[PDB]
Amino acid sequence: MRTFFVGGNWKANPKTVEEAEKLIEMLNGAKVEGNVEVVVAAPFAFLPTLQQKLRKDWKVSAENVFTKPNGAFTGEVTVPMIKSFGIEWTILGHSERRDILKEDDEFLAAKAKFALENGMKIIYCCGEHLSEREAGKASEFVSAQIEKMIPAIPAGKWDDVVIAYEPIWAIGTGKVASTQDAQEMCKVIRDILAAKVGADIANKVRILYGGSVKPNNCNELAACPDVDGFLVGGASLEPGFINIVNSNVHSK
Amino acid sequence: MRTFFVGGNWKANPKTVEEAEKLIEMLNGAKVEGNVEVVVAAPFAFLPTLQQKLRKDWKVSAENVFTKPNGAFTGEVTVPMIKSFGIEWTILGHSERRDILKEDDEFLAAKAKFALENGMKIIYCCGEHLSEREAGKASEFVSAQIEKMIPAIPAGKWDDVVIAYEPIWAIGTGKVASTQDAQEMCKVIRDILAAKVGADIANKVRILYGGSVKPNNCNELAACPDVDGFLVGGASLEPGFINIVNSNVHSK
Ligand code: NA
Ligand code: NA
Ligand code: NA
Ligand code: NA
Ligand code: NA
Ligand code: NA
C-alpha cells in the first residue's frame, strides 16, 4: 500500500512571521494517528523559521522554485538556496502559478527536471478548467499535462515525485466537485502513468486530491481507492488540518 | 543635494545561506566614506538572516513583492511578510522580471501603489531595449513606463520612491553603454518627473544608474550631475561593492 500523503499548502499566508510561529506551535502539539507522510509548504520568507521550529517527523516544502541554480533572475529563489536550509520538497505547477503568474508546461517540466536532478522531491500539480470539464475532455487535458511532465522526470527519480490533481473548474466557478470526481481523476492519472511508464511506477506514485479538503469531507475522500492523500489549501492554516492528516486511517 | 543612493542587488545569488552569511560579514567590515544611503537586496529565503546580521546603518530590501497582502497566491511573498521582519524596501520592475517572468506595467503599478500605501519604500526600475535605442526612441519608451508609474504613487509618498534606469539594450546584446548614456537617461527621467509632477519632486527623487557598474567606472558615473547613485548587479556580491558605495564622494 502506498504511504498516505498530506501536504499543507499555506499559499501566501500568513501575513506575519509571528503568526507563522503560532501556527507551527499548534502543529507541533498535534496527535497524528495511523501512518502518514506530512509536508508543510510555506512562503519563502518563513521557510527558515519553519525548518528550524517545525516538528522533525514532518518535512518542510517550498511553494515554488526557479529553473536554475542561481544567477540573473531578480526576485527568484532557487533549489540550492532551499537545500541550504535542509529543505527537501517543493510544489510545482500549482494552478495559481499557472494561471496568475502564467507558468507554462515547458517552464514547469524544466523546473521538475532541475529540481529532481538536484535531489529535491516535488509535488507536481495538474488539472483542468471549467470548459474542458463541461466538454467531457478532462482526461484528455490532464493527460497532456502529465505527458509533458513525464519526460522531465530523470531515471531513478519516480520515488521522489508526488502528483496533485486540482479541479480548477471547481474554483470560483459556481460549481463544486464531488467525492466521485476526485476518485475518477486520480484513477485517470494512475492509468496514464501505467500506460506511459509502467505499472510498477503507477503503483508507487502517490496521487493527491487538491480540491477543497476540509474536516467535513476528508474521511470520505481518503477512502477512495486511487486517492493517496491531499494537497490542502485553507485548512492547512487551521486546527482542522490535523483531522485531514488523520484521515489516512480511512484509506486502504 | 539629494543623498547619494547605492543598492546592491544580489539577484538570485548566492546559492547558499552560508555564502550569504560570509558576504554579510565582509560588508559589515567595510569602511564607508562620505554620505550615502546603502540598501542590500537579497533572495527571500536569505532575508531573515540578512535583516538579523547586516550592519544596522544599511537597510535590507526584497527583490520583488506581490500585489496583495496575503491569500491564494502559491509561491508569492507579500509586503506584510517582509515588513514582519522589519524590512522596509523592495525592488520592483527589474528588467529580469519584466522580461523573463513577464511582469507588465499594469502589474507593476499595482505593486508600487500597494507597497507604498503599506509603508514600503521602492526602487522602481525602467529602461528600453535594443530596438528603441537604435531607433532613437529611448526617451519615449522610458517616458511611457514612468507615466504608468506616476499615477500609482500615493499622495505624500514620493519621498519613498527611488527610480533605477536599466540600459537593457546593453545587456547581452553586443553593445555597451557609455558614461554619457547614463547621464542623458537619468536627466530624461528627471525632466519627465518635473513636467508631470513638478520640480520640487523631481529635485528630490533619486534616480539611479542600473547598467553595469564596477570599481573601474563607478567614480566617473557618480560624477554625472543627474546620476544619484546605482542599482548594482554582480559587483554587489564582491568586495568591489564598497568602492561603488564610496563613489558618492565624486558626486555633487
Ligand atoms: Na469524454
Ligand atoms: Na530514486
Ligand atoms: Na485512498
Ligand atoms: Na529621438
Ligand atoms: Na511621505
Ligand atoms: Na551624480
Q: What element of type H or E holds A90?
A: strand A89-92
Cell numbers given for A5: 500523503
Cα dihedral sign, A100-A106-A109-A111: negative
Question: Three cell numbers at B175?
Answer: 553593445
**Nearest CB to B18 within list A66, A77, A84:** A84
Q: For the range B98-102, what are the long-range contacts, defined as Cβ-Cβ under 8 Å and sequence gap of 24 or more?
A: B98/B125, B99/B168, B100/A73, B101/A75, B101/A76, B101/A101, B102/A102
Do B81 and A49 make contact, defined as CB atoms within 8 angstroms? no
Does A101 sit within 8 Å of B12, measured CB to CB?
no
**In one letter, which amino acid is B220?**
E
Q: Which residues of A touch B44 (CB under 8 A)?
A: 43-45, 77
Q: Which of B57, A86, B40, B245 is nearest to B49 (CA)?
A: B40
Question: How near does any CA of chain A get to the CA of B15, in Å?
Answer: 5
- Would you give the DSSP letter of residue A48? H
Q: Closest to B81 (Cβ–Cβ): which among A9, A16, A75?
A: A16
Tell me which residue of B75, B161, B88 sits closest to B125, measured CA to CA.
B161
> Are the beta carbons of A210 and A185 closer than 8 angstroms?
no
User: Which stretches within B69-222 are classed as H helix?
Assistant: 79-83, 95-99, 105-117, 130-134, 138-149, 179-197, 199-202, 218-222
**Beta-carbon contacts below 8 Å between A and B:** 139
Q: Kindly determine whether residue A43 and residue B44, on different chains, have CB atoms separated by under 8 Å.
A: yes
Task: Give, for A38, the enclosing helix (H) or strand (E).
Answer: strand A37-41
| Residue A41: closest CA among A2, A96, A3 | A96
Distance CA B23, CA B164 (A): 24
Instruction: List Cβ neighbours of A212 (8 Å cut-off, separation of 6 or more).
Output: A170, A176, A177, A233
C-alpha atoms less than 13 angstroms from C-alpha of A166 in its C-beta half-sphere: 22
Query: Is B145 at the interface with chain A, CB within 8 A?
Result: no
Which of A219, A208, A220 is CA-nearest to residue A37? A208
Question: Rounded to an integer, what distance in angstroms lies between the CA atom of residue A113 and that of residue A111?
Answer: 6
**B233 neighbourhood in chain A, CB within 8 Å:** 72
Q: What is the DSSP letter of B240?
A: T
Q: Does the annotation mark B94 as catalytic?
A: yes
Residues sharing a CB contact under 8 Å with residue A23, sequence separation 6 or more, in sequence order: A14, A237
What is the sign, positive or negative, of the torsion defined by CA atoms of B168, B169, B175, B178?
negative
Helices A138-149 and A105-117 cross at an angle (nearest 10°) of 40
In contact, B133 and B182? CB cutoff 8 Å: no
| CB atoms near residue A15 (< 10 Å) | 18
Note whether B180 contacts A: Cβ–Cβ < 8 A.
Answer: no
What is the Cα–Cα distance from A78 to B45, expressed in whole angstroms? 9
Q: In 3D, which of B36, B28, B33 has the Cα closest to residue B52?
A: B28
Cα of A65 to nearest chain B Cα, Å: 8
Q: Which residues of A touch B11 (CB under 8 A)?
A: 71-74
**What is residue B36's DSSP assignment?**
-
Residue of B nearest to A75 (CA): B63
Residue type, A42: A
Q: Is the dihedral of CA B100, B233, B8, B134 positive or negative?
A: negative
What phi and psi values does residue A37 have, to the nearest 5 degrees? -100, 115
Question: Looking at the partner chain, which of A14, A71, A74 has a beta carbon nearest the beta carbon of B70?
Answer: A14
CA distances from B136 to A177, B3, B46, B189, B209 (A): 56, 31, 41, 16, 19
B78: Cβ–Cβ under 8 A, 6 or more apart, which residues? A12, A15, A43, B65, B66, B68, B69, B70
In the numeric block, the cell 542600473 is attached to: B210
What is the H or E stretch that residue A61 is in? strand A59-62
CB atoms under 10 Å from CB of A96, counted, come to: 24
Gap between the Cα atoms of B46 and B12, Å rounded: 10
Spacing, Cα B28 to ligand 2 middle (Å): 43
Instruction: Tell me if A78 and B233 make a contact (CB, 8 A cut-off).
Output: no
> Are the beta carbons of A143 and A193 closer than 8 angstroms?
no
Rounded Cα distance between A226 and A203, Å, is 10
Helix (H) or strand (E) holding B208: strand B207-209
Measured between CB atoms, does A106 come within 8 Å of chain B? no
Instruction: Closest CB to B96: pick one of A18, A73, A80.
Output: A73
- DSSP structure string for B66-107: -SSSSBS-TT---HHHHHTTT--EEEE--HHHHHTS---HHH
Q: Which of A63, A96, A128, A166 is catalytic?
A: A166
**Resolution of this deposited model, Å:** 2.0
CATH number of B1-252: 3.20.20.70
Q: Decide if B13 contacts B235 (C-beta within 8 A).
A: no
Distances (CA, A) of B124 to B97, B163, B165, B206, B239: 12, 5, 9, 11, 25
Per DSSP, the three-state class of B123 is: strand
Closest by CA to A225, choosing from A182, A168, A163, is: A182
Burial class (CB in 10 A: 0-12, 13-18, 19+), A106: exposed
What is the maximum span of chain B, computed from C-alpha positions, in angstroms?
48
Is the Cβ–Cβ distance between A194 and A206 less than 8 Å?
Answer: no
Interface test with A, best of B19, B81, B107, B236 (most A CBs within 10 A): B81
Kindly list the distances between the CA atom of residue A29 and the CA atoms of A25, A54, A239, in Å, as whole numbers in the listed order. 7, 10, 11
Query: In DSSP terms, which residues pair with A62 in a beta bridge?
Result: A90
Residue A171 half-sphere exposure toward CB, CA atoms < 13 A: 18
Task: Look at the block and give the residue holding cell 502506498.
Answer: A2
* 3-state SS, residue B144: helix
Output the nine-digit C-alpha cell for A16.
Answer: 506575519
Helix (H) or strand (E) holding A228: none
**B17: closest CA among A138, A126, A78, A152?**
A78
Relative orientation angle of helices B138-149 and B179-197, to the nearest 10 degrees: 40
Looking at residue B136, the DSSP 8-state letter turns out to be: T
